[PDB]
Amino acid sequence: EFDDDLVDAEGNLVEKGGTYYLLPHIWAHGGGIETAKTGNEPCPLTVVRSPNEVSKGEPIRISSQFLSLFIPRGSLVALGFANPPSCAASPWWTVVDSPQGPAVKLSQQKLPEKDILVFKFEKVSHSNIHVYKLLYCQHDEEDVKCDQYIGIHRDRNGNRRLVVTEENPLELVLLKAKS
């Protein structure tokens, strides 16, 4: 039988707990992931995509709920900045409801595991390099259901904000970071 682990951009299994750049499949759609200070936030707590196609963005830790060395693709994962802005209490991304829909943010406090272990990579068929969509998993009730995708919403200021999308899910390739 098969675990079907996540594969990085260079064909190597993704290491659980390892740090990767989250880059667009399409070269022209921007660079890696970073942060921005939006709305009334006191500091950069909004997770966004760099507009710089040359930027690999920040190194992101990818951790599953398991101890395994690798990550089964059906595994829930948490995603965090290896080097978060100083004002975030931890590196981990979380999803916050809003008038216009759920958005991806950092937090000024430490959150429970059930608020950060809310993502899952979904392999994109019809592709040579391993490309993944990024799902958000809301509470089913006693569990979670991964039935929404993360996409990009460009705000009035140009920020390419990561938010729950309904029509154009982003597609990433995971490139191993410095070491």
From Swiss-Prot:
This is Chymotrypsin inhibitor 3. CDD domains: beta-trefoil_STI_WCI3-like. It comes from Psophocarpus tetragonolobus (Winged bean). The record marks 67-68 as: Reactive bond for chymotrypsin. Disulfide bonds join 43-87, 137-146. Inhibits alpha-chymotrypsin at the molar ratio of 1:2 in state of 1:1. Keywords: Disulfide bond, Protease inhibitor, Serine protease inhibitor, Signal. The keyword Aminoacyl-tRNA synthetase does not apply. Belongs to the protease inhibitor I3 (leguminous Kunitz-type inhibitor) family. SMART domains: STI. The keyword Disulfide bond applies. It comes from the Eukaryota.
